[PDB]
Amino acid sequence: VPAYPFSLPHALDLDPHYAELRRDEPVSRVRLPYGEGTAWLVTRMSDARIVLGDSRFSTAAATDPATPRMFPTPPEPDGVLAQDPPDHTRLRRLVGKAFTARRVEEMRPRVRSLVDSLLDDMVAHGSPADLVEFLAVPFPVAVICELLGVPLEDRDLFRTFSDAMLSSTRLTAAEIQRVQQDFMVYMDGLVAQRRDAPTEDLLGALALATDNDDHLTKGEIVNMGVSLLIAGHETSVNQITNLVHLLLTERKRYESLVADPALVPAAVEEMLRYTPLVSAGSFVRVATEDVELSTVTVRAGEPCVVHFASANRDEEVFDHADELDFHRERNPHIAFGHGAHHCIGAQLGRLELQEALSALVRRFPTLDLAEPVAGLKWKQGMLIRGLERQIVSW
Ligand code: HEM
Ligand SMILES: C[C@@H]1[C@@H](O)[C@@H](C)C[C@H](C)C(=O)[C@H](C)[C@@H](O)[C@@H](C)[C@@H](C)OC(=O)[C@H](C)[C@H]1O
């Protein structure tokens, strides 16, 4: 009967319904915006983990246009989200060898230098300035270029492609396709260059063959490079803005990081959990077999959808879940998702946020929201929450 999403999202607030559903009906039936049929909506942490983690659920199935989904275009079956084991498991195994947490930490110095440069630009502009335009938008795409060892001259081409891939793209041409192909040929050439001469970047590592051993196709590598750019961009850009919003609207929080800069990483985790970056449910999971959740048993062929932010506010798991606490002992949030499809960029997402917050705290202890709160322009049509603009003063 009821439609999902329940209501239009306001700011980063959570719909009061979810909290009711956790208590009264953890697994509810719901009608999604675009597929045919009803689906199950999972609202609690244990259930969410089961749907995400257990092999009895398939994302590949969700590619059927008849299958319910949050977004208008049926999913592309090539998308790594839509990959099912064991082909998906191979991709993850191989890319996971190169995308270590150790490789990400080693980027931190170059990433610090990158934020510093962006902020210097913002100081050149003078207070007050749009933190979106100067920090949130440019920073993630630069970070990903660093990760792919793109030379500085060619980064222009990556920005255009990321902006063109977003559904909100202003240009919205027939030409988008022209950009896509132009970009694709470039990536081809970049991977071929890596095959000819090994580089220390993540493309370089993926290009290497121990030659008695498992490695990716050149075409697989190109496609993976595009996958990493797109997944990492939209989420990161808005997530930066969202953490800053939380920090400044109750400024006691930002002051807490000024006082103790070592608190930043803990704070980032807490804000990842607290922020409903994904306004809607999850990419759909269709049951290959009967599976037993908390309160209901899902029959094979029934579609499930997870709301990550609700799970993150589950009262069983988190004391004062509705409150924002940078001094939690444990924080097992699924802001990055869970199981097979755990965002690969989970470490590079954390790096990006920790480095943006630390830089702000270090260069601007006097940082404050210049735009009035009521004035704030939140993005309206989107799967992902974020501010169109965020004017700040220092
Ligand atoms: C704040 C930053 C980020 C957040 C909150 C985030 C969140 C997520 C979530 C929740 C998923 C899982 C969705 C599902 O399973 O239904 C996911 C998947 C993914 N994320 Fe992210 N992400 C972030 C940044 C990035 C970055 C920086 C990269 C890459 C550089 C990235 C690449 C991916 C990829 C490739 C997947 C696909 C998972 C798979 O099937 O292997 N994301 N992300
Ligand atoms: C990599 C990201 C990932 O973080 C996912 C989980 C974000 C949200 C929850 C989605 O999964 C969203 C449902 C996507 O799968 C697609 C609708 C797509 C159009 O959006 C996306 O393409 C976004 C960018 C995904 O590909």
Author numbering: 14 to 407
Paper quotes:
The bacterial P450 OleP, from Streptomyces antibioticus, is an epoxidase involved in the tailoring steps of the biosynthetic pathway of the antibiotic oleandomycin. More specifically, OleP catalyzes a regio- and stereospecific reaction of epoxidation at the C8-C8a of the macrolactone ring. Among the known macrolide epoxygenases from actinomycetes, OleP presents a unique epoxidation chemistry since it targets a non-activated C-C bond, which is a reaction not easily achievable through conventional chemical synthesis protocols. In addition, discordant findings have been reported concerning the timing of OleP activity during the tailoring phase of oleandomycin biosynthesis, showing that OleP is either active on the aglycone intermediate, 8.8a-deoxyoleandolide (DEO), or on the monoglycosylated one, L-olivosyl-8.8a-deoxyoleandolide (L-O-DEO).
As for OleP-6DEBLS, the crystal of OleP–DEOLS (ionic strength, I = 0.2 M) contains nine monomers in the asymmetric unit arranged in six open conformers and three closed ones. Therefore, in the presence of the physiological aglycone intermediate DEO, OleP can assume two conformational states, an open one (unproductive binding) and a closed one (productive binding). In the open active site, DEO assumes different orientations and conformations, but none of the six molecules of DEO expose the C8-C8a bond, which is the target of the OleP epoxidation, to the heme iron. The residues of the open OleP interacting with DEO are located on the BC loop (M83, F84, L94), on the N-terminus of the I helix (I243, A244, G245, E247, T248), on β-hairpin β3 (V291, G294, S295, F296) and on β-hairpin β4 (L396, I397). The functional groups that decorate the DEO macrolactone ring alternatively contact residues of the abovementioned set, depending on the position, the orientation, and the conformation adopted by DEO in the active site of each open monomer. Electron density accounting for the sixth coordinate water ligand, typical of a low spin enzyme, was observed in four out of six total open monomers. It is placed at about 2–2.5 Å distance from the heme iron and the substrate ligand, forming hydrogen bonds with the backbone carbonyl of A244 on helix I and with the aglycon substrate, involving the C1-carbonyl or the C3-OH or the C5-OH groups, depending on the monomer. A further interesting aspect that emerges from the structural analysis of OleP–DEO is that even the physiological aglycone substrate does not induce the closure of the OleP active site in the full population of the enzyme, at least in the OleP–DEOLS crystal form. As a consequence, efficient binding of DEO that induces the structural changes required to close OleP and to shift the iron-spin equilibrium to the high state, preparing it for catalysis, occurs on a small fraction of enzyme molecules as supported by having only one-third of the protein copies in the asymmetric unit of the OleP–DEOLS crystal form in the closed conformation.
